[PDB]
Symmetry: C4
Subunit: 454 residues, 4 copies
């Protein structure tokens, strides 16, 4: 015979009925492998105009994305969104801080007012004399460098002054930047996500309330590339206006639509004029909306449903919420999502806001939902907590990339663009997983065991 | 195109087959928001004649509703039902106590027999002399007030006597009431549930056994507004008679039908002449009937099924049992319920019967089913226990209201009347939730976390 | 209108497809109540010829049924089966012991050989002299009683001798029995299960292996009323022969067929000539067959399927295994079962074999499957353990009866015969229960709680 | 009537839709028993050319199969596969070591270089003198034996020298072997799996990467009988080539195809020229692929689907992964599998690699997946751990055999060949198991319990 039938379920019959299943409810039948995993191209679109080397994106939460994270993320190939739980000024600062970050050049030099350099030497010896400028008269005659400044002469010249951060200025003695030694052989970031001006990409979230139009402005000034509207149910006249307002004012600016879960919700945003859709309502580890409200939708189905529609307009979808492991990323992407947003899966990370604090013989790192009472009487829709400890976004992300690539390989696709083309064509196959199938899917029948991922 | 199909399940296909699903088995797809949550009107009917500002209702259990609770509940916009685990006299007392409660006026002044006022002063100094009247001859010549008594002159006049509870009498020196300082700026209860005589509404539960006709009488005297028949299976000739007996005797009185779960059970009660139906069999946190019997029905389905029928007669349905969180309330209401009754979700509360007693580094408050051996050889159908500690019904209820409103908003309804009109029309959409969907629905992927709701 | 549709699932569509559901997977919609629970008649058949006042039956396990249990059970209205884990002689003894038990008369007087009465007096005072008969010459001239012996003169006469167990003999000084004081006002057992000779009924289990034909014989002699073949898969040529062998030899004797789960398995036994069928394979608390084999079937479905067939021949079915609570009994009976057999649910009991032994601040009582390595290289198909502590079969059983009656009432049936007639007619309604429905079905949303059943 | 319908589900309708169920999701309805369990023949094929007495097969993991295991397994009637986590030389050694193992003859005599025998005597008395050959001049004149060596004269002759391991040599004083006393009455292995040269069978796993062709060679030399390609997704051009390469070079050699789960994946391997298929992706206790990727399939369905196809070509299927108990073996075999491979279920065993180390008052034995970071930045797809303690493969396996036989009996098949013929014909019946059915399936309703299997 040499036939072999067409066993396997198609996306349609699996996510277009009314059962409402999530990532852990299904699998993806393998295909034919004839290329190595690293040959898999993960290039994907974040918006109608922007494209990242990797589909990963950090969430706009006060415990996940902040300068450091938006930078690492961008450097590793993804992008980040600065949360909006702080006066517009500060949030806007985190943007410019990112938007004008340059290899080797000092991050954002801590500084003080006279109220010249100031090397520890002084601070030590010789009562706290009348202010700093006094206890520190660092003569104009000092080791500084001209605008011809470069990483080359920098470090080297630093040897003469045996210092590790010589200052640089344009012409009007107003520090443009300070080169720094601290790393000893900077790596190369070939996938770095940057804009036209070669600066790293940077996103930012804002509300849809009136007092957010000013906030947006400060961000816009700072060179923000894309902004996402923060809402649990983004299909409101408020967001729609907020959309129009922004698109009009700033034509040259991408706007991602508030969190939606239905094709109907999307229609309004795609019409308002959005550049993408953030799909996901009540899937976040810290989000507890479905339990305290009554509205929401199972992630896997939501991502599939909203993408199949959004695609018909060239509007990328960001699968936000529900990604509890590498696996769930490939899943979300295979269902129509162009990129995926993470929060908890990127909390412990060292680039994330906050500091670690061992608790009960185990590592730790704060992490809560922006809808929690702390982050914010108001009805709490989120919870507060903390997670373990992962490596650094510079090594963690690369691991995610390998997984996603290994996933694509097992399936038979050499790119994410293909994975989607396959599932929409009916070539990509799926299969439901019973509770026992889920149990067998993970670790079982062991007396004890540990786990290390990369 | 600009079409977007009609994705979404309708109530019918979801609760009218035979799967028997509960609140945690489904969700409600969001709609369009074009109004703020606080604009949502929660007005709902408790019976054919009565209407509350809020659909909340405390349960007739000896650990939930009692004077204090029936008062707070009424003040916050809902209503309460005094349990019937105590001689009719006492239960009847709790009613009048409620029915004639007035702002500022002392609750129910504790008192003693001679066997004039009696300020601590005496009790202290000068052997327990022959009875109270002796160890306390408080002269007729004392600070008291005339029927012109008002909160105005009251407190003020109290200053002269530097006391905090001057007595007031009509004419025949028989204390009608005592004004009291103890609060320092009473709030305003705009939603208060009151009757024609401007007195707070008050409900009361009674059995269907013969010896309950006298009990009902004492309650009726006390000015009870509505009574609910307490039974697990209320479709018995006993209740039906008890219905007729009451409707006849007291025409001007609402009667809620025993707990039912089917349209067939309802028919008998709607015919007997009930003013509402209490739907719910074996859903209560402390009820364990389904485990020790064989009869019952999944709450969500029961509420939907009995309401779709009851509505065809203008008979309100009270979704009693199964409400484990704010979310489940909106759910019950969206399925055809006019109001919802709670027990455990209103136990810890300070207005509830009993006192707290820290246990294992944690707060506590007794709570058990009226079907438990303690509350009541008889077959125990309930269990006994206790819960944590919530705020006060004066702040807790308001939180429930916000939730329910936030829920209605997310859906797209500006009132509960609308939410039901939407689900019966097919506009309101639902989606089943798999076990994984339920797991993703709540908190997951966190190393640890705490939870605060309002 | 006044119609009300026909909501509700019928047994057929619920247990005749291939889903394989158990008791916890469904419920029984209530009906109309017009009679009190105690008016419910539980009379049910155990075999084609025998009938018990109650459908309860103790299991033939070395930790459940033994003389004491087969007696209490019979007295409370049910029946018991002596296990066969002991030489035929001893098992046969437990039978006669039961079969000839009489109110007041000493159970089975412990005794010694000379190698007259022997009151402690002696044992105490005056070296262990040459044997008992010597250290105890209780003269012929002693307080004894004639065959006219009766509970009347007995106790009374005992006063004169101030003893508590005067001996009685026929004529040939061979103790027929000894009356005993130890209770102080024996109760009345109106439901007692007895045979023609007014003796309590008694069952007994035997294997189907060759060496079991002798064992059966000793039992037969002892006046056993019914015997059950002990097998996990009773549809073997071995049992079929064993059936024929017995039916032939002892026509006047009931034989219950080995454990089966299908209508096909039953056909062979009903033809071999059985008087009943023990349905249930791998449902017992201690049975772990399904996990270590590959054959078996979900109890609820098995009971329904085998009964619908067996009934077509007047062959009663004993729902054995899976009854984890009062509720599951009514369920099994409502599906076609005539009686139900229990093991674990009757372990802690005081009438059960073994003694209690507090462990970890909690009561205890051994309990294991006859298929366990201990009870019995052989493949273990059962496990060994222990349970808590229930009352006495004289109070526990009565509780089960109330439940079963309360269950029948809630449904609307005044007898078990009716409950079955209702489910087979399509009048009795059912509804599946989702996992959440099962969770809501039991205790939930409580911070803590205890449980007392009767 | 005497008909009895055809209740029961067929494999087809149960594993050929898209639900994806595992072993714990179904059962096998019993049939007719007319033969004893030990009469059941378990003979099954491992490949197109090879046949084992028992369908058991140890997995190629560095914690399961290694010489000792491949020997015991072969002796008990099955076969084993040496893992490939060690230079080809060593892995190849483990093969020859096995391939030339002979009863009584010393396993693999530990040895040292001069850098004659060497009995402890010396080592003790008389500074570590210049090397061994010196501190030990065991004269040529010593107790040794000629090629006529046999277990007969061996042991006996050993008495004269009162030693326990006399050396034997061919002619050129180059030890061919050493007979040893250490057991005191060697048993008989009637089912031993051997090749034409009467040597025990031995399998070995290799990768499909280029540098594996040399490795294969060393194994081939050592007399390996069958080799299995180690891959999670074995349907790649790499394996297909690796297949062709081997089949060509070594015609007289069996090759088992990489792990597959679909009929489509199989087609390529059956065409490449494989002798069997290893079905199973992400079912292993230590495999966590489905959780960190997105591809895989529920074992039960995979085994059924791939076998129904593979059989159409006479290509045996090895159900690898998911076997958590005796029961699951019969299940896998009944669905079309010819043999089953185990890992964890054969870890604790004494023949397995590694030594035990009590931990927390309990026994222990290391066990991890070859995909774990330890066994192997790379993406970890497995985990590391350890299990309890089972007996010895010489007693454990026999237990598995009894189970599998007991299973076959309960069904009604006298051989595995029959079990499959029955399920493909539609005679063998199945039934799904709900979560409650699964709960009832195992141990429940017990206050406590222990477990011993054989
Ligand atoms: C905000 O972040 C989230 C996100 C992204 C998600 C979830 C979530 O719970 C949160 C936290 C809660 O966000 P939100 O539900 O509070 C939405 P939002 O922040 O826009 O607040 C909405 C309310 O603000 C008021 N509002 C919004 N815009 C205006 C406006 N233009 N004028 C007046 N009032 C407005 C209304 O009361 C409207 O209901 C979730 O479950 O899935 C995704
Ligand atoms: C009473 O509260 C509940 C409620 C409200 C619920 C559940 C529950 O378990 C209880 C506790 C138990 O109530 P109930 O089942 O004991 C019902 P009820 O209190 O009316 O007692 C009923 C029995 O009393 C006797 N009875 C009732 N009325 C009469 C009568 N008129 N004459 C004689 N006997 C009567 C009968 O034996 C009838 O079976 C439940 O599972 O869902 C809701
Ligand atoms: C015995 O009790 C049970 C019961 C009642 C149940 C289960 C259970 O596991 C046990 C314990 C195990 O009983 P069994 O499976 O060992 C059945 P049985 O005691 O009859 O032993 C059967 C074997 O004995 C041998 N045999 C039986 N009769 C003969 C015979 N006539 N001649 C020769 N051999 C025979 C055969 O090897 C036959 O397979 C269960 O899962 O559901 C109900
Ligand atoms: N409910 C809340 O308080 C809250 N806080 C954040 N979120 C949503 O959950 C997402 C993160 O989900 P996760 O941690 O990847 O499961 C965020 O991007 C945001 O959309 N929700
Ligand atoms: N079974 C019992 O003892 C018992 N006690 C109270 N109840 C029922 O449960 C309801 C409360 O449910 P809950 O606590 O909101 O889940 C009560 O209103 C009553 O109808 N049941
Ligand atoms: N597998 C075993 O060892 C074993 N031992 C007893 N049993 C079966 O289980 C039944 C008791 O079930 P349960 O305890 O009521 O769930 C017994 O009547 C018997 O049929 N099974
Ligand atoms: N993922 C991993 O690291 C790993 N290691 C081994 N395995 C697979 O799992 C199988 C063993 O499964 P189990 O232990 O019987 O459930 C092995 O034969 C192999 O196919 N997988
Ligand atoms: K969630
Ligand atoms: K309950
Ligand atoms: K069981
Ligand atoms: K697994």
């Amino acid at each position: 015979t040499s036939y072999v039938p067409d066993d396997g379920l198609t996306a349609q019959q699996l996510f277009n009925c009314g059962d409402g299943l999530t990532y852990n409810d299904f699998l993806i039948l393998p295909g034919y492998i004839d290329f190595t995993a690293d040959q898999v191209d993960l290039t994907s679109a974040l918006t109608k105009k922007i494209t990242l080397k990797t589909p990963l994106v950090s969430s706009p939460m006060d415990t996940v994305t902040e300068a450091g994270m938006a930078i690492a993320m961008a450097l590793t190939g993804g992008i980040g969104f600065i949360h909006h739980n702080c006066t517009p000024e500060f949030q806007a600062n985190e943007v410019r801080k990112v938007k004008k970050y340059e290899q080797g050049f000092i991050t954002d030099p801590v500084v003080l007012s006279p109220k010249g350099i100031i090397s520890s030497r002084d601070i030590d010896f010789l009562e706290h004399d009348c202010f700093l400028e006094e206890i520190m008269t660092k003569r104009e005659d000092l080791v500084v460098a001209p605008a011809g400044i470069t990483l080359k002469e920098a470090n080297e010249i630093l040897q003469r002054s045996k210092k590790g951060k010589l200052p640089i200025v344009n012409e009007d003695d107003e520090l443009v930047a300070i080169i720094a030694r601290t790393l000893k052989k900077n790596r190369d970031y070939p996938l770095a996500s940057k804009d036209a001006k070669k600066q790293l990409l940077c996103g930012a979230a804002i509300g849809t309330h009136e007092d957010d139009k000013y906030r947006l402005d400060l961000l816009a000034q700072a060179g923000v590339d894309v902004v996402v509207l923060d809402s649990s149910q983004g299909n409101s006249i408020f967001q729609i206006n907020m959309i129009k307002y922004i698109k009009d004012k700033y034509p040259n600016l991408q706007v991602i639509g508030g969190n939606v879960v239905t094709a109907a919700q999307a229609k309004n945003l795609i019409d308002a004029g959005v550049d993408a859709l953030r799909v996901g309502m009540g899937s976040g580890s810290i989000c507890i909306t479905q339990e305290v409200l009554a509205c929401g939708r199972p992630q896997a189905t939501a991502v599939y449903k909203v993408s199949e529609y959004a695609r018909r307009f060239g509007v990328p979808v960001i699968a936000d919420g529900g990604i509890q492991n590498v696996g769930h990323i490939a899943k979300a992407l295979a269902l129509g999502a162009s990129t995926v947003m993470m929060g908890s899966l990127l909390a412990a990370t060292t680039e994330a806001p906050g500091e670690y604090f061992f608790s009960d013989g185990i590592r730790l790192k704060k992490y809560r939902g922006m809808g929690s009472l702390d982050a914010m009487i108001k009805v709490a829709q989120g919870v507060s907590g903390a997670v373990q400890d992962k490596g650094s976004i510079h090594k963690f992300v690369p691991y995610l990339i390998a997984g996603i690539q290994h996933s694509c390989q097992d399936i038979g696709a050499k790119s994410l663009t293909q994975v989607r083309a396959m599932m929409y064509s009916g070539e990509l196959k799926f299969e439901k997983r019973t509770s026992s199938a889920q149990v067998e899917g993970g670790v079982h029948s062991l007396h004890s065991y540990e786990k290390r991922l990369f």
